[PDB]
Each structure stands twice: as C-alpha cells, then as structure tokens.
Amino acid sequence: VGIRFCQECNNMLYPKEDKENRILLYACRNCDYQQEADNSCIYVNKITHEVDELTQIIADVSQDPTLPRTEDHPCQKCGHKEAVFFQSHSARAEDAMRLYYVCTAPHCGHRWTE
Amino acid sequence: FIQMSVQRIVEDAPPIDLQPPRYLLKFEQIYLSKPTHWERDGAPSPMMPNEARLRNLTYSAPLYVDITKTVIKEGEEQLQTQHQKTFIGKIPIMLRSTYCLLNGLTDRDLCELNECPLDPGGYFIINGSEKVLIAQEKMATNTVYVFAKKDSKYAYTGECRSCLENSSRPTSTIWVSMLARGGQGAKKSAIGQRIVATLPYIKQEVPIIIVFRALGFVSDRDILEHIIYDFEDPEMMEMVKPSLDEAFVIQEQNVALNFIGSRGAKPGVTKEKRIKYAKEVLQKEMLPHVGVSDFCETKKAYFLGYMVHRLLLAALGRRELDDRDHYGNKRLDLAGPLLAFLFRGMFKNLLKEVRIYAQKFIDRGKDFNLELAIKTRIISDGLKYSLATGNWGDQKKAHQARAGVSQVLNRLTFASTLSHLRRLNSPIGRDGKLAKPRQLHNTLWGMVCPAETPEGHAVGLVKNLALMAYISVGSQPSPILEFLEEWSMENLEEISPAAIADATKIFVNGCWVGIHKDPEQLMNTLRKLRRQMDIIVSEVSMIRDIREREIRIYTDAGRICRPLLIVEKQKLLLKKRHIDQLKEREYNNYSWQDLVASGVVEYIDTLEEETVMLAMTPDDLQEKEVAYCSTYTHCEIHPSMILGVCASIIPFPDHNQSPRNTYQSAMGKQAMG
Amino acid sequence: GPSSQNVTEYVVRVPKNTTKKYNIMAFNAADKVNFATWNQARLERDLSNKPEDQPWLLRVNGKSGRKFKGIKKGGVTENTSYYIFTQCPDGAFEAFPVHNWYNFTPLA
Amino acid sequence: AERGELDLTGAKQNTGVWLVKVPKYLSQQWAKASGRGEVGKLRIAKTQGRTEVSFTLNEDLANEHPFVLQSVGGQTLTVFTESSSDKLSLEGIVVQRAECRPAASENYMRLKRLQIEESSKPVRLSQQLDKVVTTNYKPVANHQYNIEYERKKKEDGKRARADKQHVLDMLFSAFEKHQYYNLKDLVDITKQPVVYLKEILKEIGVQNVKGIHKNTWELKPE
C-alpha cells in the first residue's frame, strides 16, 4: 500500500513479475535494483471514505479562544472537567453533525467523539 | 510617496555607462522647494493656493537632483565631476500636506490668506480645478489562492501574484493547475489527473516535475520531499504518482531546460540560446518575491512545493477553497501607491532619451553636455496630464489606460465634501449582472458603511468607509526578521525535511522564512512587544491559525484597520485612571498616542479579525453567569462607529426600514446649505 | 567520565593573516563516505562554466574512482562570519576564518 | 605536482577541525585582533550532566559568550585551504559546530543600539530646500563647442596637397600587407582631401564593396 524507493539512485520502484518462482519483484527503471514484496498487494481504493477525523484533529486546538466549552463531559484519561467541542468542518458533510471533543487540560490532548 | 517612494526610484536605477573613452552618470540625492510661480519676466514668487484657483494656475513644486559624471578612458586619469541641484521637473502638491504653504498654520493666519480654517485638504489644484484621487481596490498579492473553474479543463487552480518590493512595473503571475477527471479517453482513465503549470513568458503548459528538475533536484526522492512533508500518508502519495509517469523519459537538467526553453516568446534556433533563455525566465520571472538573485534557488523550490502541497489538500477535501470577495484578500491604492506607479514609467522614459541624445552626440566625438540632454517637459506634463483627465496612462495611450480615477471635488454642501475624500471603488465593470461582487459581505463589519451606496447601474461598486476605519501606510520587514532569527527560528536551508511535520511554518509578508517548534510562546511574545511599541510598529497584523499549523505576518500598505479595546481575563484594561486624565488634554499633553503606547487599545486588521472574540459592550457581556462565552479577547468602543459620514446624521436609524437609510445617504449629498 | 567531569581553559587568538584561504567542504551524512578509501584526490574548478566563483570538481581515486561536484552557497558572511577553531600543542586555540561554502554531491 | 592536484593528507590523517559561527560585530572586533591576531581565550567545562564552552575577549580586544553546540549530522564537513603560494591543502574534517549567543547581558533595545551604530549612513531621504537654487547660467560659448572649435583649428591644414607620387609609395606600401583597405584606413595615412585622395585612389586602383558596403580600395591586379 505504501511506496518503495531504490537503494542506489533513490527513485520509484515499480512492481514486476518473474516467471520462475511466482513472487512479486520490485524493480527500478533507471538502474535494475531488485527485491521481493512482503505483502504482495499493490492497489487499494477506498470509496466509502469513512475515515474518522479522530486521526486528523490536533491537540492544540484547545488553545482557541473562539470555540465553545463545556463542564458536563469530563475527560476519561485524566479526569479534567472541561472540554471544547466542534463539528467536522470538512467534506463528507451529508450527515455530519457529530460533535468531537478535546480535553483542555495542559498536556492531555485526549480526543473522543460520542 | 514624496519622502521615501521618490528617493528610492532614482537611487535604484541602472547607470548609463556609454561609449575609445566611455562616460558615467548616476543620480544621488533629490531636493524640493516650496511651490513657486514664475512671473512674466522671470521673477519667481511663492504662489498661494487662492491665486491658483483664481488665475487657473497649477499648484506644483520644482524638483532637483545631484548628478555626477566620470569619464573613463584609462587615459592615466579618471576624471570625475558633478552637477548638483539639476532641474528635472515639477510635481503637484496635495493641500495641507507637509510640503504645502499651509502646513502648521494657525487660524489667525489661515484667515489672513483668505482660506477656510475648516477646509479639510487632501486634493490637488490642477488648472484651477480641484481634483481628488479615488482609492482603487485590488486583489492581495504574494499569497496562494485556490479556486475551481467549473467550465474549463481544470479541476482546481492556484495563483500567486508576485512583486519584488515595489520595484517592478508588471507583476508576474503563475498558475498551478490540475486537469479534469472525466477526460474521455481509454488511456489516462487509469492513471488519473496530471498536475500542470502555466509559467509566464512561455506558450505551452508544462508538467511540474519538469520545472522542478530545471532547478536541479533531478532525483525523485528529493522532489517528493518538497511536495509531501510526511511519508505516512498513502492517500496523497497516490495522487502525485501519475504526475511522475509523464515526466519519466526526460530525466536530466539540461534537456529539461531545452524543453521549457523550446516554447518561448522566441523559439530558439540553436541549443545554447534556449538553455540560456530558459535560465533567466525561470530565474527572474518565476516568483520574484522570494528572491531574484541567481543564488538561493532552494527557496524557489520550497515555495513551489508548498504551492503544490496546498493544491492537493483542496482535492482530498481537507481544506476549503478561498473566497474571492472575502475582504481580507483586498488591498487599497491611495495617492501614494498610485503616483509612485506613474513616476516609474516616466523616469525610465527620461533616461531612455538621455542615451538617444548622448549617442548621436558622442559618435562625432566632440564632447558631452548634460544640462541640454534632460527634457524637462517629460515629468511636468506627464503627471499633470493624467491627473487632470483621469485616464491612468499616457497621452498617446488614451486607449490602454484605466479610467475613472481623479474626478472633481464635490462642493455642494460641507458633508458632500467629506463624503468624497473617503470613497472606495471596485474596478469591476459597471454593467455586469454578476451579483457576488455587489452583495454585502460579512467581512465589511466596521470598515465599510453598510447603508450608504448609490442606486442605478453602480449599486455596490462604489463604497464609503466607516468613521474609525484606518488604512495602513507600510513599513520595512527588516527589524522583525532580525528579531525572529534570534528567537530560535530555524532557517530553511539548514534543516532536514523530516523535521517539518510537527512545526509551524512561519511566513513574513508572503515569503516562507523558516519554521518553529513552540509557536504559542512566540505569539504572545510578538504581541506584548507590539502592545508597548518597542521593535514593531502598531499597524502590523499577526495571524495564527491553529489548525493549518502556520503563522503569518504582514507589513505592507493597503490593509484596513480599526481600533478595539483589549480585554484581559474578564476585565477591561481601561481603568478609571485613564479617563480622569484624558478629559484634560488641553493643558496636560496626554492624548490618543499616549493611549496606544500604554497597551489599552489596539488596531485590528480584517485577517486578524478571524482569530478574535469580540464583546459588544462591557457592562453587559463581561459578567460571570451561565454565559455565552468566557474567553473574550477584545471589546468595542461604541457600536455606532460602523456607519459612514452621510449615514451618521440620521436620528434613530435603527427604527427605519433598510432601503430608506440608503436613499437619504444619497440624498443629503444634494441639500443646499 | 571527563565529558561529564572535565574542566579546562584555553587561550584564543585570531591572526590577522593566513598562508592559505579557508573553505568548507561539506558531505551528505547519508552517504557515509569512507575517507580512508580516498587514496588520492584531484580538485579543480568545474569546466561547464567554460575562477574564485567556479564550482569545484573533485576527483577521488582517479578520474572515475570517485567524482563529486561542489556548488557555492549563496552566502557565508552575510550576517555572521564562520570560524575554524583549531587546537594547538600549547593547548591554546587558534581560529581560522571561513572564506566560502561549497556543496559537494555524488555523481553517477 | 600539478595545479589540479588535491592533497588528501588531512583526510587520510583523519584530521579533525571545529566549526564556529560568529556574529559580524564580534567578527569586526576580531579583525582588530590583538597582537599577532589572538582574540582572547576559550573556556571549556564539562560535567556528568552538562558541558559548557565559552570564549572571553582579549582585554585589548575588549577596548561571557556562551556557546550553542550545533549538529554536523546530515552533511559531512571538512576544511580545505589555499596558500598564499596557491598550494592546496586539506587541514581536517569538522568534528564540531557551534554558535556564539548572548546570555543575560542584553535585551532588544540594547541589541538595537548596535544596529543603528552599524548604519552611520542609512537609505537616503528627500531633504527640504530653502527658496530656489539657480538653474540657468550665462555662458557665452558652450564648453563642448569650444573644444570642437580648437580641434578643427588644430586640424584642417595638414592636407598633403603635394607628394603627387610619394603617396603612392606609402599607399602601395600599405596595399601589399592587405589586398584592400577601407577609405577611412587610407585617410588615416594620407591627410589630403578625400575627393583628391579618391582621385589618387581611382588613378592607381579600384574600390570594391568587398561585400559589406564599407568603401574599400585595392591595387589593380594588372
């Protein structure tokens, strides 16, 4: 799923097929450095696009003076009783009125939806 | 314009070395004298602004310069000589300025010259008439904007208009496109869209990997670290993969320069000229605001990478597109940045015709004399023409110029005079039916009057600015850069592109100038310096967006500001001690300036106004309760300062229907008094 | 150890003259070049530009044993001078000015 | 022994060098190096949990600078020399990089005075003149015209009206060295009138365009 760079000329390693041992070989097209593939899959295309933005929001958003705050929902990892919440603010806005939270305690940065 | 912007133009001009012997000429210092009128028999005398109106004169001041001339013939002696205070021309003078005859006079003397002590000033007197310059709007420069033309081949587009610090007549613009997905073809259906670029001074589109290699960086591990800042992202790397496939066969520097060098304003017949031609166009016309020297070409690579890294984020749907009419992307051209633009094209035109007079006169080998070379009618009649008639161009150029500037002052009633010296103008057409450049935008709060506008065909095209709105004048970014480097800011060259994922890119005036790893302490250190005015002047804006993880700083001229009240934890910073000593300015010498320099008010730009939380009134919004917010950062002075000049004479304007307030503001301008 | 328990003081001099100009020769760490493999080297200004501005051409272990091209940095003393500090037998330190910065890279 | 030959001794000795970044004002103090050119003394204190290096200015040079150690990783650095005898030498490899920084001795205003003192002359300003300076003088003969008049009086008189046959000695003389000469080259030899010179040129020769205008005369091939 990732990418492979050549170890000699630092370029993009293409996948190739050899008719001897039935194993995927990654080859270069400037030099001919070789090696075998460990996962033996090339292409993947996610159409659902249901990526949870809990992996994209940053912990320093709790320094924003223009975001609402809450005393109801406390943090689990530290027990702080003050959070700051917001919406998806991105694409995939068909049914996007969820409410992600971020703890505001210094050096906690814990994030969670509900 | 007349203390700095005119001295720099003659000082930063190429000498005219010319030739056997050869000669030198270079200009050093500029002087001016008070406006003067030459009588019929050649006896000068200072002209007062009143005679200029009665006798249909023109209110202008003569202009001098120091020129030094050295002859270089290696004739065992370098003979130099100088002619100081050489006459050049005459510049109009705006009334009540620091160079007028009415500067700093008292009412007993203003009445003695038959002048009104209430006259505001700020207009020219040209052939008896009274002309006023209208501030023109303009799209902001040196920033990246991402749009989406839903009619043409492109699925996304970026733009960056660049100009190297007030020194270029044109402004080179560069696009970074991306072709459409639904390209009907059984070939590219599989690979996908290819990122393209449309450089200036070339005919054909160019793939981006090619123009990357023309700067060096032929390897594809080094290119793909200027464009992608973290290699744990497979979704983005998949999108840049089909950009390499078409630039795969051309894999070295010199053949790349030939590829772009083959299609220019002149197709190269030989090879070395194309490799020469492609060298400077990619060096002096590509992103001149970053650096124009032939060195420091790693910076032109990073910025071109950031321009492309930002185009992909707009395709994965991770950041929203830019707004065209968002009033934080606009700049205003006052009389300063307008006369300076018109003075360049007439100083070059004055040097272009000292050569033509020197060569014709030095081939015969006689000698040289410069007092006869200077055609004085170039600058005098050049400015006076375009101001008097309006078309912002040249006399033989009455077809290529922008019209509508410099109209006649309105003197029907005293509030029709003030409402003329404070007026903007958006340069879009006067009959286009597109509503989005005409409707009222949220960002006009407090900086443009919402009610005052004319009807007819010019609805929403001309606008008047609010009462406390203040336009900035400009400064040099030198003293902030020297402070930033000593506050732990890593330069771009001496850093590894893997220490860039968790750092906040620091921009200054449009140019990427480093990174930083602890921004929140930098920010509230930059601010507490401006609050008390040690290193940074009060008209710079400093934006920080937490999410996109960067920091911007601006120092240029054209941004529009307005003062606000600074708020600490939940209380104002304006204590009573400031009031009982401010009601005594008459014999205490304590005024507005001593109020800014004490850190209780602050000018807030439009861009900076998106990272702020305002309260509208102290006694009512800053009380602890079950409250709306609790982190207020500023507070307004009085919410009645959001109205213009002609709309703030209406009693109880918050009780009328809205179109009614628009009619009167365009109707109190024609009331007799 | 002495890196934790070592204390010393040495004199520093900055001679107003030198018998040779001092430059920096920089290598990418990522290459991890074994200098021991450099039996010999040749070093000449690059010929593409057909002097002090000329990029260097380094030929190690023969004409094609090893070859690099060195490109001059934009600036070296634009804001702050760079000094070479060398230890002398008397323990005192000697400082040498850096004249230029050249960037050296490997060549297929 | 060759010009393009590089000494590898330093490298092969594994000679190490140190690299230190120094501010210009200090470096300007250093150009005034005391005595031979010693600028002071360096102090190095290493402990189990910390290491401190600093340099102190020569008392003479004066009339604490902590060091910030920098990484040299990612790029191998070596020092190479050019002697005053133009001999080339590699002194060593850089084993340390560092930066001299201020510490508890200044704030921004203090730093600023130094910047101002370095300007002395800033970018030029437009000054305000008093009244109006004289512009038009009363010269009688323009100076350029008088220089031309003198040259024309010193010339226009050496016309070699005689030498009816001797020129031809000098003209042929020149014509043997190059088959043809531009009328101007021939004039540079004969100061006599061009019309009369052309008659002398036409009498003993013919003018060819030679192909790029440039009136050029040559001896008849007969």
Ligand SMILES: [Zn+2]
């Ligand atoms: Zn390879």
Ligand SMILES: [Zn+2]
């Ligand atoms: Zn927490």
